[PDB]
Design an enzyme around this catalytic site. Structure first.
Site, PDB file in Angstrom:
ATOM      1  N   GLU A   1       0.836  -1.189   0.000  1.00 38.59           N
ATOM      2  CA  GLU A   1       0.000   0.000   0.000  1.00 38.59           C
ATOM      3  C   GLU A   1       0.879   1.251   0.000  1.00 38.59           C
ATOM      4  O   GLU A   1       1.805   1.364   0.802  1.00 38.59           O
ATOM      5  CB  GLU A   1      -0.945   0.006   1.207  1.00 38.59           C
TER       6      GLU A   1
ATOM      7  N   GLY B   1      -0.618  -8.948   6.381  1.00 34.20           N
ATOM      8  CA  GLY B   1      -0.613  -9.712   5.151  1.00 34.20           C
ATOM      9  C   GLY B   1       0.677  -9.593   4.372  1.00 34.20           C
ATOM     10  O   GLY B   1       1.254 -10.600   3.959  1.00 34.20           O
ATOM     11  N   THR B   2       1.144  -8.362   4.168  1.00 35.21           N
ATOM     12  CA  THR B   2       2.361  -8.155   3.395  1.00 35.21           C
ATOM     13  C   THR B   2       3.596  -8.522   4.198  1.00 35.21           C
ATOM     14  O   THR B   2       4.480  -9.225   3.697  1.00 35.21           O
ATOM     15  CB  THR B   2       2.457  -6.705   2.939  1.00 35.21           C
TER      16      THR B   2
ATOM     17  N   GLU C   1      27.901 -13.492  16.797  1.00 37.30           N
ATOM     18  CA  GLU C   1      27.922 -14.127  18.109  1.00 37.30           C
ATOM     19  C   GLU C   1      26.576 -14.725  18.474  1.00 37.30           C
ATOM     20  O   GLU C   1      26.518 -15.875  18.924  1.00 37.30           O
ATOM     21  CB  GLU C   1      28.344 -13.121  19.170  1.00 37.30           C
TER      22      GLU C   1
HETATM   23  N1  GTP Z   1       4.890  -2.220  17.279  1.00 35.35           N
HETATM   24  C1  GTP Z   1       4.120  -1.740  16.311  1.00 35.35           C
HETATM   25  N2  GTP Z   1       3.256  -2.578  15.649  1.00 35.35           N
HETATM   26  C2  GTP Z   1       2.468  -2.104  14.664  1.00 35.35           C
HETATM   27  C3  GTP Z   1       2.523  -0.775  14.316  1.00 35.35           C
HETATM   28  N3  GTP Z   1       1.646  -0.569  13.321  1.00 35.35           N
HETATM   29  C4  GTP Z   1       1.039  -1.737  13.028  1.00 35.35           C
HETATM   30  N4  GTP Z   1       1.535  -2.696  13.859  1.00 35.35           N
HETATM   31  C5  GTP Z   1       1.159  -4.113  13.882  1.00 35.35           C
HETATM   32  O1  GTP Z   1       0.953  -4.608  12.577  1.00 35.35           O
HETATM   33  C6  GTP Z   1       0.004  -5.649  12.630  1.00 35.35           C
HETATM   34  C7  GTP Z   1      -0.781  -5.776  11.332  1.00 35.35           C
HETATM   35  O2  GTP Z   1       0.053  -5.625  10.209  1.00 35.35           O
HETATM   36  P1  GTP Z   1       0.238  -4.159   9.586  1.00 35.35           P
HETATM   37  O3  GTP Z   1       1.664  -3.708   9.757  1.00 35.35           O
HETATM   38  O4  GTP Z   1      -0.717  -3.205  10.250  1.00 35.35           O
HETATM   39  O5  GTP Z   1      -0.120  -4.281   8.030  1.00 35.35           O
HETATM   40  P2  GTP Z   1       0.739  -5.275   7.123  1.00 35.35           P
HETATM   41  O6  GTP Z   1       1.623  -6.130   7.983  1.00 35.35           O
HETATM   42  O7  GTP Z   1       1.528  -4.462   6.137  1.00 35.35           O
HETATM   43  O8  GTP Z   1      -0.338  -6.159   6.343  1.00 35.35           O
HETATM   44  P3  GTP Z   1      -1.392  -5.407   5.406  1.00 35.35           P
HETATM   45  O9  GTP Z   1      -2.349  -4.613   6.258  1.00 35.35           O
HETATM   46  O10 GTP Z   1      -2.141  -6.430   4.601  1.00 35.35           O
HETATM   47  O11 GTP Z   1      -0.644  -4.485   4.483  1.00 35.35           O
HETATM   48  C8  GTP Z   1      -0.911  -5.308  13.789  1.00 35.35           C
HETATM   49  O12 GTP Z   1      -1.127  -6.444  14.588  1.00 35.35           O
HETATM   50  C9  GTP Z   1      -0.165  -4.271  14.593  1.00 35.35           C
HETATM   51  O13 GTP Z   1       0.047  -4.739  15.898  1.00 35.35           O
HETATM   52  C10 GTP Z   1       3.387   0.071  14.976  1.00 35.35           C
HETATM   53  O14 GTP Z   1       3.432   1.253  14.662  1.00 35.35           O
HETATM   54  N5  GTP Z   1       4.190  -0.413  15.976  1.00 35.35           N
HETATM   55 MG    MG Z   2      -0.343  -3.531   6.173  1.00 38.82          MG
END
Ligand code: GTP
Ligand code: MG
Ligand code: GTP
Ligand code: GDP
Ligand code: GDP
Ligand code: MG
Lengths: 51, 427, 150, 426, 427, 426
Positions: free
Chosen positions: B61, B134-135, B244
């Site tokens: 995205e 997902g990604t 290490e």
């Molecule tokens: N620690 C931390 N986790 C995050 C943050 N933003 C999203 N997440 C985690 O990311 C998980 C979901 O995946 P996302 O990163 O939101 O989206 P994605 O992994 O790119 O997958 P898609 O939505 O299909 O594109 C959620 O369970 C959130 O806990 C962040 O700013 N900090």
């Molecule tokens: Mg995402």
């Protein structure tokens, strides 16, 4: 919708207790006076030189 | 000694985006990209006086990516290095691993190739992703697979973000997690778990920030990553490199899952009162009140622990405190490892970010351990996977994309095999 | 394909290479110098230039040149009209010999440090124009490119 | 000292020549008014190769502009750097040929070429030691191809000892403007293989996808293409104009690249060519320039060089560099992808270095490869030419002007045998 | 006792451009021509307070010549000593030997005739040229011919730049090198080969200059020439003149080809580092890591050697070192020449050029030897010459210029004769 | 005359060596630039054992660094007396072993050791008559232990008639840095028992105890411990560099301390060591040196000598002392604690006197005792080795590189037989 009114609302509701105890990013401040040097020039904690 | 860092998913690129702010601050680089040897493990000097990072943000995205492309660090990141697709995998492992990965991974890897060819003494890779999405889950696994067939021998540090037990923001993340581990087992050499609830409780308790956004989380995670690579970036009294952890923390080729911890996470007022010494931060790094994973190490036994020390630390008292830890009986080690520790000391203290909530302390500790509570976590995810799978819920999206039931059953028995391995090893 | 193209303000259709062009003007001020509530991306609010001195350098350059470089091209809505090429030979801007002007603050010139004037792993602008190798070696100055790197 | 006389033909040659004199004038630091405004005296010592002193430091080029329509003359004297062309050098017909080789070669040539021969002679004996001639023209057009080919013939019959470089743009079927492009291309090629000493085959298809893939431009107007071609021409001639560590003139390049007299069709490339966004990030090292030179997507012709073998190649480098890195880079590129070079010639890569980088860049390079992948380009033209002749289509626009059918059959024969000999060495 | 030097081609006068810088620096002559008897063999003392060299630069392209005319050494060189043609020979032996030579060579020889007239005690000529080009090959051979016709008995020390086996800059250099060797055989009285890949490896290995240009090559080659004319220039314990290479190293009228070497090639840091003694530099002057021609004398057998020593050298230790060399067996001599060495010592140490990469050394060794690995050189060059000649490639350039197939055939079979010669003598 | 070359391996060895060359340099009075600045003549007369004059009295150490990470090289070049070293002897890999004995002994050694053998060769034939070699390394790390001990084996295969001193840091359980300490120490011990002539075992535990009780320092940085070991190494090689009333060369000490070829692990101590507060309250006499020397808390190993017996012992005294006082002190010590000495060997203490003290002190002594209490250290390492190896912990990073299980079984065999023969001779 104006910077002024938006800021005056917060200036008014700063008297709230939750407004001071839940600053979205800041955290609770406690209003403690520090000795003017521990924030920036000197770091916190006990200091014994290694280098 | 050079290492490159790739960021997959929406969580990974927000994390490293906090990391690179920390790195430019640690090395004195203003965000426009010029200085007003130690940097060379991250920033490669090129163009005109420009220190451009060895990193690629890649995601499907474009919302968060072009957000970076317009943000404060417009001039830092090389424009080509930020790979952005057109449409999301949308929390669908099959969509990210078979539909969209098939067009994106070749461009990602042959960028990676020319980054590694600009590199000279490449130490390894380190990836940033959350396996719930997902990604970050799907094409991340596909990216690690093709990187392993590309190099194989080079160590790959995987800093993953697992879903918390009770606090959760998706519905199919058990499916995504299980399918992500099935490849994270046999591709990552060293994988560090960091869920979100543990950081939530830390920010509530110690940092007493009660409405924490994602940046506060990403800020202190960047502090942890910077802390375990400061040995490569700066000379210490006792330095340990990225190879290490490969040797000293992985007793078996399939048991590589490491709890993280950091201390002292302390605000400005709590610093002016606590006396910061070495013995008590070594203590502070061991209670579950300051771990980055919501698990109970009292139910588990340690395999091997590692302790990074930054700042003003002498080897005398760290040896003393580690002695006290080994002589305490509240925590226990396995019967295999009498030398259950690995210490490390570095000279440069942790820096402060203006706007951050951590005060400037003389010293800090980053603990990276290995236990069996992680085996408890995987069973926890396994149960909630089996419940949803018993009714075949949400399966039709994966089948409609092109996957089937075979890999669902075999990934299920793979986590069951991992469970049996942890129960066999713990004895 | 030859279909119509969105404006450079919209983030699509090769917007990046355009935003980062020299004869491109945006009707609104850059995010780094913005100041208010109302339309702050979460990332943008928390990530701001840490150093006030850096902000000062930034603002000096931006104000002196880019803030009022062009204003006629700015329309009523605030969206700058694309320069329209007129004549067969008209060229929009220099593309091949990009570093036409060297050594300064703005992005279009190189940002090189005064000590690392000319080196191998680093250079995008000519250290010295019209200085022969044999000339310099006879003057006995050491060849700049031969200096080592870590 | 060593004199290059420049000749521009047709609309394409006139605009390309206009941008050419823009870059060369900049490199010698002369203003668009015609007076010198440089600083280093490295420039003033070698402006006699391209300019002549008029009055008080006023240097005017040694160029001949040739066409049939005042539209190109106004396009010359309207744009920048138009104030410097001598009015006597604007020999100029009035009718306009317009995509007809017979008009370009028999009717308009018969009364235009005597006056261009006057001015070309006057501008040739006004200098002492010619290096040769350099002509930029087109093949799809009529007033460029016809008039240029007839002058190339006539001047090669008078001055058989001087060098001759020709930059010719050939038509390509994907970017194909006119309809009689094969009728004109074939007859021009039929003449170029005997009278031109060495040719630099250009086209617009290769130039368009370069501006799309590499430079990542949005509206690649003709000005930018002419600017690319201008960059190539300057990179070719840098050696006569500036001192270096290893100087290499045009005849030096011709003997290192032409093993057989009919085997003289080159493909050309230029480096560096970076995206507008990437610029600042890119670094300038000889390997970085080499990886862009030998890439197939950086040729300025519609010929994938990996469909055949490189026969010889030449690299012209500009800027203060180290020759060891230069030579070991050519050795590595000659040993890794070893099959793409011919076997019965070792050390197929000629190199040269000059110590003056182009204005605005730190370090440049120019590639001139004599490959055998040119025959597939001429095949793609000859197969179309033999399509129309079978139906005698558009022939009247030719047979009614003096030309016969045997000219066309001769064109088939010559095209077929030269692609035969290139395929032979493949 | 004087010696005049001629420089032919683009290489010849750039080597001279560095060589005459060395001579000015060794005799303390300002670049404007006046000092602030040892110099009398190179700098004639015109008028009062002005020395002007016994040299000729010549070329057919005026570019590099008037670059000399406008360099630092404007007042030093006679205006007409530097000769400059109008147009280049352009990598073409026939062009440099028949068309342009016929008008430049006569002005060259009636110029050196009055250079020799101003000279009194002429030792001979020493020439500087390259054979890969056209100007050095063509009219260099044409000049050497008319030199041998005019004087003949005066020696002709030839330092020629052959093409390297792998590293190459031209394409027709095999043709030009062959046709030049065909006349270099019976005209030069003795010749020293100089490749470029060998010197590139030297500056890469010993000096550790990672990206060297031609000026570094020219500088240390000038150091070699100065180290073998130091005997005429200065007084030593045991000085050997120019007519010695004639006698002590040419056993047969068509075996005159010599590998040269130099030690110590050491930068400014390894100097303080290393204890320079005669034993190790006499050893290091023998391993092919210090030979100026890329070949291996392991495969060959030495015929004669010559050793110039400069600086603080007593005949004791040089005698001891060559004794250890004769008693070693890693290298081998031919059996038909037992006394295979000649020595020579001069007192003054080799001076350094500001901005140069060589350090102030106490003592240095210039070794010039004869072998049969040069017979290996010519075979390796003749093989790739036949490769091109079988297809008659590039021939039309030479024939159109005026030559025919005969000169190709006769130079080919001559190199064949030299091949049979070397293999016969070596066994 | 007698020659000692120095070889440093690993990070610990390199920093120990750096402090050691500082100590030796200040004893001989040469500044970090390599020039002499001392006063007395007794200093120069024996510096050929450790130095080579380069050009005009510039002395460089006869030492060879050896590691795999540039970080250690930056640290040794940055500190004082760092520029005195030998830029060519910085023979140094680039990949990095990373605490993997197989990586230090099978992969990186396989292509780096030929280079270090060339260097150590050149350094050996540079001198006239070698006495022995002096290696400083540890038994926990990878690039120190593995490559160091392979260097030991290759050297012993080349020069079998020369002595060999190895200062080796052994791991202690309370101060235990890495996790594969038993896996590295056991394999290294297996190599040293066959290859090395004698090993002076050290450990950080005893050093920390020493700076706690006797020195009473606040923070014992690594510079202080390395300073201690450096003073010990100066003390053992003092009898070669300085005349004495009873000289004891290296081989002389070897033959007096080693009764059986496998019984060559020494516990070492140094005297005096007193806090600067208590320095004024003590005197400096021979009995005051002896009471501190034979003190069990002054050994530099975590091996209680009173838990076992002394096979042999030696004491190297420095300063203008009384020989009669020395032997009667050794005699009384041997007669009082007669149970702690072996029965079937009379006169269990060799003694030597040198006439030159360390700088700043009046009188000093160095103790090298070959006691049987070292079996406690080997038993303590062997039980950790068995505990890990029973269930195959950490075995694949060794197995997947080329090592087999037989090496580990053999290592256990050899450690077990040497501890049994220590038990036998007790
Ligand atoms: N620690 C931390 N986790 C995050 C943050 N933003 C999203 N997440 C985690 O990311 C998980 C979901 O995946 P996302 O990163 O939101 O989206 P994605 O992994 O790119 O997958 P898609 O939505 O299909 O594109 C959620 O369970 C959130 O806990 C962040 O700013 N900090
Ligand atoms: Mg995402
Ligand atoms: N080592 C070294 N070689 C040089 C130098 N200058 C030229 N050469 C070599 O000369 C060879 C070819 O001859 P050139 O000097 O280029 O030209 P030329 O011999 O004068 O022949 P023309 O080009 O026709 O004038 C090349 O292979 C170069 O390597 C130099 O300064 N040092
Ligand atoms: N690259 C380039 N091509 C051009 C330019 N002007 C015309 N052409 C090409 O020339 C071809 C036709 O040539 P033309 O102008 O008819 O030649 P002329 O009529 O004989 O002068 C067309 O395919 C155009 O694409 C120019 O400025 N640059
Ligand atoms: N005395 C001393 N010991 C050290 C020093 N640095 C590391 N060590 C010890 O060396 C042991 C590990 O050796 P290591 O440095 O890992 O060896 P390497 O990795 O192969 O070079 C640890 O137990 C440390 O206690 C030092 O500066 N001084
Ligand atoms: Mg030349």
């Amino acid at each position: 919708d104006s910077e002024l009114a938006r800021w005056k609302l917060e200036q008014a509701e700063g008297v709230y207790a939750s407004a001071q105890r839940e600053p979205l990013g800041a955290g609770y401040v406690r209003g403690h006076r520090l000795p003017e040097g521990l924030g920036s020039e000197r770091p916190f904690g006990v200091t014994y030189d290694a280098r | 000694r050079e290492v490159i860092s790739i960021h997959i998913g929406q969580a990974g690129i927000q994390v490293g985006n906090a990391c690179w702010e920390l790195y430019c601050l640690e090395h004195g680089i203003q965000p426009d990209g010029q200085m007003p040897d130690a940097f060379n493990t991250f920033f490669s000097e090129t163009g005109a006086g420009k220190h451009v990072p060895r990193c690629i943000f890649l995601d499907l995205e474009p919302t968060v990516v072009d957000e970076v492309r317009t943000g404060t660090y417009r001039q830092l990141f090389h424009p080509e290095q930020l790979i952005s697709g057109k449409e999301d995998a949308a929390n669908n492992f099959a969509r990210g691993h078979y539909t969209i990965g098939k067009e994106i991974v070749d461009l990602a890897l042959d960028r990676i190739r020319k980054l590694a060819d600009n590199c000279t003494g490449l130490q390894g890779f380190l990836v940033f992703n959350a396996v719930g999405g997902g990604t970050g889950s799907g094409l991340g696994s596909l990216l690690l697979e093709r990187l392993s067939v590309d190099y194989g021998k080079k160590s790959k540090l995987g800093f993953t973000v697992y879903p918390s037990p009770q606090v959760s923001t998706a519905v199919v993340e058990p499916y995504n997690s299980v399918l992500s581990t099935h490849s994270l087992l046999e591709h990552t050499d060293v994988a560090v778990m960091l869920d979100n609830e543990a950081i939530y409780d830390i920010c509530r308790r110690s940092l007493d920030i009660e409405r924490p956004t994602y940046t506060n989380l990403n800020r202190l995670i960047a502090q942890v990553i910077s802390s375990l690579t400061a040995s490569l970036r700066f000379d210490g009294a006792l330095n340990v490199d990225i190879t290490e952890f490969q040797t000293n923390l992985v007793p078996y080729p399939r048991i590589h899952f490491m709890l993280s911890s950091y201390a002292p996470i302390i605000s400005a007022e709590k610093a002016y009162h606590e006396q910061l010494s070495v013995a008590e931060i070594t203590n502070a790094a061991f209670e579950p009140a300051s771990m980055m994973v919501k698990c109970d190490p009292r139910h588990g036994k340690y395999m091997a622990c590692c302790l990074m020390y930054r700042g003003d630390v002498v080897p005398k008292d760290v040896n003393a405190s580690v002695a006290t830890i080994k002589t305490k009986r509240t925590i226990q080690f396995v019967d295999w490892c009498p030398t259950g520790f690995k210490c490390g000391i570095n000279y440069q203290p942790p820096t402060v970010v203006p706007g951050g909530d951590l005060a400037k302390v003389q010293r800090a500790v980053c603990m990276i351990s290995n236990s069996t509570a992680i085996g408890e976590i995987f069973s926890r995810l396994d149960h909630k996977f089996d419940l949803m799978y018993a009714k075949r819920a949400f399966v039709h999206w994966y089948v409609g994309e092109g996957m089937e039931e075979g890999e669902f059953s075999e990934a299920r028995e793979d986590l069951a095999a991992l469970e049996k391995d942890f129960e066999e090893v713990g004895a | 394909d030859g279909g119509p193209s969105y404006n450079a303000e919209t983030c699509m259709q090769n917007w990046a290479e355009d935003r980062r062009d020299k004869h491109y003007k945006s009707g609104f001020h850059p995010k780094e110098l913005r100041r208010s509530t109302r339309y702050d991306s979460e990332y943008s609010a928390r990530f701001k230039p840490t150093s006030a001195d850096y902000v000062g350098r930034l603002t000096h350059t931006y104000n002196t040149t880019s803030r009022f470089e062009g204003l006629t091209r700015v329309g009523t809505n605030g969206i700058a009209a694309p320069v329209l090429p007129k004549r067969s030979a008209d060229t929009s801007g220099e593309h091949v010999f990009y570093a036409k002007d060297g050594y300064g603050p703005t992005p279009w010139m190189d940002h090189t440090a005064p000590t690392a004037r000319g080196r191998f792993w680093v250079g995008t602008a000519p250290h010295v124009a019209h200085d022969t190798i044999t000339h310099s070696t006879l003057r006995s100055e050491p060849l700049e490119f031969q200096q080592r790197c870590p | 000292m060593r004199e290059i006389v420049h000749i521009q033909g047709g609309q394409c040659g006139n605009q390309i020549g206009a941008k050419f004199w823009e870059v060369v004038s900049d490199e010698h630091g002369i203003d668009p008014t015609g007076t010198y405004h440089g600083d280093s005296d490295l420039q003033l010592e070698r402006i006699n190769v391209y300019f002549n002193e008029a009055t008080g430091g006023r240097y005017v080029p040694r160029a001949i502009l040739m066409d049939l329509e005042p539209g190109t003359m106004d396009s010359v004297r309207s744009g920048p750097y138009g104030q410097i062309f001598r009015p006597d050098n604007f020999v100029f017909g009035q009718t306009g040929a317009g995509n007809n080789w017979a008009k370009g070669h028999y009717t308009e040539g018969a009364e235009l070429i005597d006056s261009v021969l006057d001015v070309v002679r006057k501008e040739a004996e006004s200098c002492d030691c010619l290096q040769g001639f350099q002509v930029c023209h087109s093949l799809g057009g009529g007033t460029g191809s016809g008039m240029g080919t007839l002058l190339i013939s006539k001047i090669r019959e008078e001055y058989p000892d001087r060098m001759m470089l020709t930059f010719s743009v050939v038509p390509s079927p994907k970017v194909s403007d006119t309809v009689v492009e094969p009728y004109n291309a074939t007859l021009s090629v039929h003449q170029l293989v005997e009278n031109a000493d060495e040719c630099m085959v250009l086209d617009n298809e290769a130039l368009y996808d370069i501006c799309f893939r590499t430079l990542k431009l949005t509206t690649p107007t003709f000005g930018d293409l002419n600017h690319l071609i201008s960059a190539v021409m300057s990179g070719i001639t840098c050696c006569l104009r500036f001192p270096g560590q290893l100087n290499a003139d045009l005849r030096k390049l011709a003997v290192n690249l032409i093993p057989f007299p009919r085997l003289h069709f080159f493909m050309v490339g230029f480096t560096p060519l970076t995206s507008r966004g990437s610029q600042q990030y890119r670094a300038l090292t000889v390997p970085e320039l080499t990886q862009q030179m030998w890439d197939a997507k950086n040729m300025m012709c519609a010929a994938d060089p990996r469909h055949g073998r490189y026969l010889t190649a030449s690299a012209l480098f500009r800027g203060r560099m180290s020759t060891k890195e230069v030579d070991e880079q050519m050795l590595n590129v000659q040993n890794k992808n070893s099959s793409y070079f011919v076997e019965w010639i070792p050390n197929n890569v000629k190199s040269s270095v000059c110590d003056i980088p182009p204005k605005g860049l730190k370090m440049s390079a120019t590639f001139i490869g004599n490959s055998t992948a040119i025959q597939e380009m001429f095949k793609r033209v000859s197969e179309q030419f033999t399509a129309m002749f079978r139906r005698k289509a558009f022939l009247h626009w030719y047979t009614g002007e003096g030309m016969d059918e045997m000219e066309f059959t001769e064109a088939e024969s010559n095209m077929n045998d030269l692609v035969s000999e290139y395929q032979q060495y493949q």
